Structures are given as structure tokens and as C-alpha cells.
Design a protein around this ligand. Sequence first.
Ligand SMILES: CCC(CC)CN(C[C@@H](O)[C@H](Cc1ccccc1)NC(=O)O[C@H]1CO[C@H]2OCC[C@H]21)S(=O)(=O)c1ccc(OC)cc1
Lengths: 99, 99
Amino acid sequence: PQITLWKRPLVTIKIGGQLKEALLDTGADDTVLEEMNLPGRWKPKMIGGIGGFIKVRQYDQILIEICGHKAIGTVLVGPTPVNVIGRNLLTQIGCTLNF
Amino acid sequence: PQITLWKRPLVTIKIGGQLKEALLDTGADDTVLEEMNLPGRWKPKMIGGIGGFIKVRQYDQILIEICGHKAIGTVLVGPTPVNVIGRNLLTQIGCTLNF
Ligand SMILES: CCC(CC)CN(C[C@@H](O)[C@H](Cc1ccccc1)NC(=O)O[C@H]1CO[C@H]2OCC[C@H]21)S(=O)(=O)c1ccc(OC)cc1
């Protein structure tokens, strides 16, 4: 689809078999989701944003469907203000910026 | 143009008579720029992201050119680690997300 930006580009995602709403975020290198349960192993990591750094759990090679498009990649879980889909997954679904 | 997301979507902007690099950021409601001593009145504001909130100065009706596309709107100035062009201006230059 072509998504205009008068509203937040929020979309439905499927991860761990569960539906969620997430923000398509071209300013995020990484995908960061709010606290949730995911199966498999994870590693503790740090990630920094506009206000400083937070502790996240890093899940690698996670299946996630974004607005009907499949991706498999790294998902960070932690106290982010909102679920964000970052460039690591936006590239996989073929998302580009156009003006 | 079309911008892929293999790397950060950095572009040159002109604001306050200065050229700077800034992210085209679909996840930013507002535009947030590195500390700069703009003239005119402003209003205090706090904006939150990963890590928490930062204090910024809100300037209204600021002229800003993004890849040769002119815009005018609100710009927030403060200790951000990166310049981000938010949806308030991305809509003015006709920017969409496409996949
Ligand atoms: C609330 C959603 C999101 C935070 C997630 C908001 N951000 C825009 C993002 O694009 C920032 C913009 C941003 C980019 C880089 C450094 C600071 C901020 N990116 C970001 O935090 O990404 C992190 C996750 O992936 C990593 O790659 C970048 C940092 C990591 S922001 O910078 O904090 C922000 C911008 C405008 C605003 O107006 C009300 C309020 C908050």
C-alpha cells in the first residue's frame, strides 16, 4: 500500500501468534516492542533513543507479519513508549520512502 | 525521489540559514532539531521516546527546505542526538511510505 503521513502510520502485526498494533518508524534502526512473552532464547541488550538508553531483551530470527507482509529478524522487547517497526524489518517487506 | 531503508534516510535540510543532515522519520509526530540559536519567541515543551523525555524549545512557522522541497511549520530545538524530520513536515513535502 501507499501510506500517507497525516496520521501515525499504525499497522497490525502478528508476532508469536498474537495480533498487535505497531508504528512504522523509518527513524528506528531496530524494531522495539512493549513488554510481552515470546518463546525461545533471548539476550540482554541496551538500546538508546532520544531520551537515553533502556534495557531490552533481544530475540533473534523471529517471525513477524507486518500488514500482511512476512519478515524474519531481530525483535527487541522492553519499555519502549510504543511498538515500533524499524528499518531492520521495513527493508524486508520492501518499504521505501517516496516524495 | 525514492529512498530505500538499507541505511538511515538522511537528507540535507536548510533551516535558519544553515544546512544540516536530518532523518526523514515517519515515527516522529514533530520535527526535532539539534541545539541551534534561532531568533524569535518560543514555548517550552517536553517530548518522550526511548529512554525518556527531553526538554525542547518549540518554534512556530519556521521555514525549512528538505531536499529542495519547501515547508513551513513547527520545529522543536533541544539536545537531541539526531535531527529528525517529523510527520508535520513530511506531509508538506508529499512523503509517503510504500510497500
Ligand atoms: C514514540 C515513537 C518513537 C520512539 C521509538 C519516537 N521517536 C522517533 C524515532 O524514529 C526515533 C528517532 C531517533 C533516532 C536515533 C537517535 C534518537 C532518536 N528512533 C528511535 O528511537 O529508534 C531506536 C530504536 O532503533 C534504534 O535506531 C535509532 C535509535 C534506536 S523520538 O525521536 O523519540 C520522537 C520524535 C518527535 C516527537 O514529537 C512529539 C516525540 C518523540
